[PDB]
Design a protein around this nucleic acid. Sequence first.
RNA 1: AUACAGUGAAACUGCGAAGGCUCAUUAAAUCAGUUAUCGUUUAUUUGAUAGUUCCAUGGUAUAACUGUGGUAA
RNA 2: GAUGGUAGGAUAGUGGCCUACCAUGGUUUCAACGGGUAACGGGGAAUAAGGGUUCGAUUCCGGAGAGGGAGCCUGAGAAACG
Lengths: 229, 123, 37, 166, 167, 338
Amino acid sequence: AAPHHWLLDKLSGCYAPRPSAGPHKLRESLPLIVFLRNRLKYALNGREVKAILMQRHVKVDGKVRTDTTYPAGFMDVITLDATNENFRLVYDVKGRFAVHRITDEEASYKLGKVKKVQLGKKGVPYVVTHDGRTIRYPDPNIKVNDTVKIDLASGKITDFIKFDAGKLVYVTGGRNLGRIGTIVHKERHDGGFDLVHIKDSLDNTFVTRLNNVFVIGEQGKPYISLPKG
Amino acid sequence: QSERAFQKQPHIRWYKNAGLGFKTPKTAIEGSYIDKKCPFTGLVSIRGKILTGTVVSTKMHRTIVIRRAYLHYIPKYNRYEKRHKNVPVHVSPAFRVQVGDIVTVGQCRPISKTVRFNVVKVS
Amino acid sequence: KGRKLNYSVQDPIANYEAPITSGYKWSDDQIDEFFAG
Amino acid sequence: GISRDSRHKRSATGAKRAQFRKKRKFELGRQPANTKIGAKRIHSVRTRGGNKKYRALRIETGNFSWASEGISKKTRIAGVVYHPSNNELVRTNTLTKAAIVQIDATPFRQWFEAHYGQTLKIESSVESQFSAGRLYACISSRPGQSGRCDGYILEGEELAFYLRRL
Amino acid sequence: MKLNISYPVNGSQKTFEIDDEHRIRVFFDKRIGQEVDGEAVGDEFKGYVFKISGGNDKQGFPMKQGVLLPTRIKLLLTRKRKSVRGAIVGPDLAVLALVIVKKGEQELEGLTDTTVPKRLGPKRANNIRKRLQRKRHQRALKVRNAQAQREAAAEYAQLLAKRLSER
Amino acid sequence: VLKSTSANDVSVYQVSGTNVLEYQNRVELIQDFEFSEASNKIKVSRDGQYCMATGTYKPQIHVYDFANLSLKFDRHTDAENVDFTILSWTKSVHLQNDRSIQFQNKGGLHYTTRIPKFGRSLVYNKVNCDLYVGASGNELYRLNLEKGRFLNPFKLDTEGVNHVSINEVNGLLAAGTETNVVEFWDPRSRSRVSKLYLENNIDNRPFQVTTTSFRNDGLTFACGTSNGYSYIYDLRTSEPSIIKDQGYGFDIKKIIWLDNVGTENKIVTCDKRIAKIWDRLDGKAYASMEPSVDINDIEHVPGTGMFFTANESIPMHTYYIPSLGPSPRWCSFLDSIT
RNA sequence: AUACAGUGAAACUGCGAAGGCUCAUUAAAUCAGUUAUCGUUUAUUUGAUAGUUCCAUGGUAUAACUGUGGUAA
RNA sequence: GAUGGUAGGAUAGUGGCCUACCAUGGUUUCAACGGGUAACGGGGAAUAAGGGUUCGAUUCCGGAGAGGGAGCCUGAGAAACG
């Protein structure tokens, strides 16, 4: 009854935890019970993960948010107070949620793909992201599928990454879900299979969608740290 | 160009642009045609996907019946039986489409029971 | 003129009521000598 | 009303053997409230959470708009003479959207005499109604959904556009 | 019949089992609210006037004030089909309720000469007759909310002005 | 004791008016008599109970049992109604503002059929059972309840008909057209017999006849107009008439006789705001029934002196005349309260 | 603790039950994925988001409760 | 209402979803429309098992029903297992 992304062992139970509503969707997130209890194993059961949630160790996106099924989606920096645990969780190359450990100056921010820019009411420019941070007043040159950098103390955009040909992009969606390498090709079609294409070890080619891909930095310099093997 | 009652007019001569690589002809920007559901001035907005094919019949007005044959890699009897499709489409003030006439259409806002596509191109 | 004036026979009203024999308390001769003019 | 579904009827291919389903809640067709003239009574019906809908039946105080200056002012209703979305609707004298109804134009007289001084540049076949009192004006607002009677006056082009019709 | 009688201002009420129905026949075909005399229901209570106030009949069914039809009928009350006797009183009432609004010629050792008091005095201030620190804090939090929000809004609108000047 | 309006040396009363100590001396006769802000058409059945009142928004049927003084049900019909009849008890036939016809039963909604053009009036024939329905144009249709067929529709003049009625003791089909002609057809022959023309002396504009009626002697015919002018007719010198201008005169909609109770040769006229009652052979007003709101139509209960209107307000008014007659057996203490 | 002060039958309240059997046989119309809704509803989740003032605190009307009762209920 | 156009009604809104008027359309041999079951079986609908090769994990057979049809009401969600 589980998805593939959670890295959930089959010998666990019968009812799978539906995440509650929140920032991200159901299909692109993992809740805190499947995060803490059975992935990096700070708990043994739902009772004691509710106990540490009542103790309020979790500090995801700089706020506490004491809830069992809180849908932590892409790169919400899970922060735990004891042993200064800073966790940025991204996608691995085979579809799961690889939770990388980072440090404090990297967990002081996150980034987010812009979805739409609106002239909503009363002359106010407007920007949303995958956690829905409706932050005030970016520059006019925010296209769709660019990348804002959230402040995580206040909410303001601090840095901006422009989407164009020659940018380091992350793909979350479809049969390319979780690949990095961002350059063999660029092809913007007019309604589907439109993208920037991603290399491999032998620099192979790949096809995805615009909304299923979003930028993380430059060719060699992302200010996100990434795990390795 | 007024054969019906109830103030045949644009609904706020009027002119807009859907963008996305589809031209608006100059009579459809500034002309006496009303453009109620032709998407260049229109009331509809464009979205979705864009399909292309030749026609079969344009008998009634505001009905463009496209044909659409396409390749599909059949593995069953290992030969390609040829495709055929149909879709009704509202008019545009750019081309009186006759038999032949490969044209393309964009998905928007169901107009009759079966039309979501309106002509944006002729070539 | 599709649904306009279907001259068909309908099922539940075919015996919805029942007639009456004498009907009018007048005679038909009383009709004729009533509106001769 | 009854329905909103294609299941009861045939498509563009001519299919049969329907016998489909018990009709759901979200195929809700309410009764057609033909709005008339009377004393102002609006039924406050519910839908989709607290989505109150104003169903007007006997509305009078039409806010009709002077066209060339855009002055939406308050007046009464007389009757619709031509509306062939139903040619019996004008026989029964109801009040729906896009109908051409007659108005005693006395507050428009008051506004003209108030912001121009003299009484009577404006067209002659509406100057005749400036003199007489009853001018033609077409309803814009929806009393069956928004419960209101707003409209726009007939001024010249739209006037003859309807007067050649009926 | 039994006659429930209530002297309201003294707070007294008592039932009296009156047989001998030609005494009762004064009330007959008189619906609820219409007054009555003591003279044709009794002799020992003369100068008495009773406003009738309903009454359960035999089979216990009540009458509601002012409909018609002194038999039983099936109405819709607080909405379901409840049976209710008509407001008019006839020969087949078990109890009949009465309010005495003027004492006549004889004292009654149940109604007049015996009385009960009320319950308890009032509780509200205006009912006894007939906060300011919260008024400080409400006004202070309101003017502080204004001086926070309406200044911060223009304080990022000026950052929009900086972005527009640099663009 | 309910208050009475002033009149010509006569008394009337209203129950369930717009104004009707009062809470504790309530005089309510029929419980739940109120609709959704208007009223379409009310009529009382042939037997001694079961009056039917058509609805206004989400239109209903509203059968009231007179021997229970309240409501039985409310079948929310599919469309808004204009005209119907009652066919004894439980059956009834209706037609809505669209060109559709409903057949209500004890279970309700026995059928929904249609007519090809928009209809305005319906009557039923007790003899050989064909309902005649008058509509717009050349077309006066039949739906026979014997074998459910259709019949050879009656060819009219140009614009149509506002009201159709058949005579009771002999069957003379009336059809009040627009061009002042009354177009009497014969329910035996399925052909015209006469095309009587209606005249006046004022002649404001080309009026249209809107109300037709007969009575149970079979010799006279009550005629209406779209101007507030009652008319009488006989075969005896059928070209003139006697006329009745009314003091407001918009459109008379209900003209009905008093041919089954005492105080004879009297007739009720009813236009949009007022309903009056006068005597035959002079044309002088017996009484009038001025309410506080307009009137959609009226009806008069048989055997006794009471009237039931359908109006444009929330309740319906009932009007009792203690000089025309008594109050009926189910209202048999109205003469005790007032 | 002479205007409240703990146990607390029976009453208002917040919520509970938050998804269970049998019967007649629908061929991508039952179903699964997918495109879109600047074509639309949305409790709850999450991020955001209010400037019109002439010559010291506002009203009876109902409970629970008492009291008189009816009815086989 | 078959196919579309114009306007209104109703809608949560798109929509012949319904009605007035108008045009005679539309699908099909590149398989329309129609014929049945091992449609108590099938379609990935899904888990797969270190040798069982169509047994071997499950969601769903179709829609209904709370005595029988009908009408109404409540709610973020219903034509309510209450």
